């Protein structure tokens, strides 16, 4: 019963040349769920973010025609979106409920299998309560619709932060765990171009020399914080990045964890964002001349540097290491950000979709089983 939820980013279709990704590029057998990101709120109603999206919806659905057990979800929100439309969505009950009732129709019309809520992020007591009510209402209406109609219930999932501080700030974990089908923990973006020291995007474990605060910025500590706060393991989907985060070094001779950095490193040719690289862009950086590939034995993740360019990322080995940690802890499955940034063309020299394949094969035979695991 382990689940693999893969995000598909709409804007990946705007990629140039090989980087261009369409719903048809998705292997219908890789993931258990596909989540399309993002839809938006216009007049407090679940709505297309762009007319080009309507047909995109039609194409991400009907991946079901090559795999009928594949579930397709639509995500609302995201970072660009902001926290304000969610505050106004949950300000009064009518708009809230009318949002739910019409969202159900919207989803059923497109024949989605459910909804992913990406409010990034609720903050403060009033936001906490409103996030719970939104989730509660969606869940009860999904159940209620499943009985007043005829078909199996729409799925409810949400993307949630890894930061232990953001958890306390915005998430009543026992309550949201009642109504969510899956809790997608964003166990990445622990470090990046907003910092002036080199650090890894998604380290599994911390360095022994790390401060007590730095030790909390890991996949292992974050996932366990969610458990500690009451999230049920079988609903916890641990996030796996198919991308890396890069730095421009102050000094070429200092390339170790914590070396000074002036900002993000040179953008990739396809994602066009400094401080950021997709995995197939990582490989291009890796086969350049004189690039040093390093394996961090403590953090159990790779990184690489060449001249003043430094990038920390995830490969086959780190993701396999993570699946072993996953099974050991007994989590319900994984979430992948994102399917369009795996090497979906096989240009790395390994197989097509190498990162997700490596995770899938390592989860083979795994079945989630709940058991007491101490304080
Ligand atoms: C780079 O680092 C070394 C010591 O690690 C320092 O002596 C050197 O001056 C630095 N380079 C520059 C241009 O400052």
Author numbering: 528 to 902
Which sentences from the paper describe this structure?
Here, we report an arthropod-conserved insect chitinase belonging to group III from the pest Ostrinia furnacalis (OfChtIII), which contains two GH18 domains that act without synergism according to enzymatic assays and structural investigations. The degradation activity of GH18A and GH18B (or GH18B-CBM14) in combination towards EGC was equal to the activity calculated from the sum of the individual activities, suggesting that there was no synergistic effect between them.
To study the substrate-binding mode, the structures of two complexes of GH18B were crystallized and obtained: that of wild-type GH18B complexed with (GlcNAc)3 and that of the GH18B-E647L mutant with a bound (GlcNAc)5.
